[PDB]
Design a binder for this molecule. Structure first.
Ligand SMILES: N=C(N)c1ccc2cc(C(=O)Nc3ccc(CN)cc3)ccc2c1
Length: 246
């Protein structure tokens, strides 16, 4: 997250921290995710497509720092890694950038909701917020495009949704951004999601309900003028999510 503020997991309890175990035992941070039900985390296929072995992943719920075993956190392995069959990547645009991780503890259990571990509601069909609405993003991603380390403490920020007509302007993304994608950015271009925030949530308060409107997917650079963050429009994928979690 470029700009924004530092936060803790009690303010983002649906946030899942996803790591990968390498041959030799080293563990590194991969992407964010969101808890949609006790056994299921939703994220972005681009985070996993190059290393599609479910046994390699470690998922934490209730974790506030990259390298601290936060009090109340829960550690899981991935029982099922479901990638969207029509996923693809263009130079900038990522298509069908959505994945599901069925989680299980070493005892064979799913998440136990608590003050620091909670689900996030899915949106309803054809009902996304209007352009100009403020939404929040969360993640352990880069603080500056030039950084190589990620921040130790979880971050969040707030951005505004941008219309499809505006996002398709020539100086924005033209025809590369589709109706299955949602743009969001800062009008002053000072805060945005960045590398390492992929798969994490774009949460919008809509009609009084905190909703998982988007999943961090792609963008040209980070916090660049006329280059919004681009998010998978979760409402389009409700049939796919329902069918793959039954
Ligand atoms: N401007 C944004 N909001 C934004 C939003 C998301 C971003 C994602 C990546 C990134 O590194 N993506 C990526 C894509 C595919 C693969 C798999 N090879 C790995 C990483 C890099 C920069 C990003 C910037």
């Amino acid at each position: 997250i470029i700009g924004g503020e530092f936060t803790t997991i009690e303010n983002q309890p649906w946030f899942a921290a996803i790591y990968r175990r390498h041959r030799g035992g080293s563990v590194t941070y991969v992407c964010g995710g969101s808890l949609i039900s006790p056994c299921w985390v939703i994220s972005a296929t681009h985070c996993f497509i190059d290393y599609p072995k479910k046994e390699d992943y470690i998922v934490y719920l209730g974790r506030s720092r990259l390298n601290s075993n936060t009090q109340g956190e829960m550690k899981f392995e991935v029982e099922n890694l479901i990638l969207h069959k029509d996923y693809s990547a263009d130079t900038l645009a990522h298509h069908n950038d959505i994945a599901l991780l069925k989680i299980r503890s070493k005892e064979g259990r799913c998440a136990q909701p608590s003050r620091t571990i909670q689900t996030i509601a899915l949106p309803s069909m054809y009902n996304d917020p209007q352009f100009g609405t403020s939404c929040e993003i969360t993640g352990f991603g880069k603080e500056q495009s030039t950084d190589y380390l990620y921040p130790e403490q979880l971050k969040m920020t707030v951005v505004k949704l941008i219309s499809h007509r505006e996002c398709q302007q020539p100086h924005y993304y033209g025809s590369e951004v589709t109706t299955k994608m949602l743009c969001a950015a800062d009008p002053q271009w000072k805060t945005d999601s960045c590398q390492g925030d992929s798969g994490g949530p774009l949460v919008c308060s809509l009609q009084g309900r905190m909703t998982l409107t988007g999943i961090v997917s792609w963008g040209r650079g980070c916090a660049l003028k006329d280059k919004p963050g681009v998010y998978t429009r979760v409402s389009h994928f409700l049939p796919w999510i329902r069918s793959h979690t039954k």
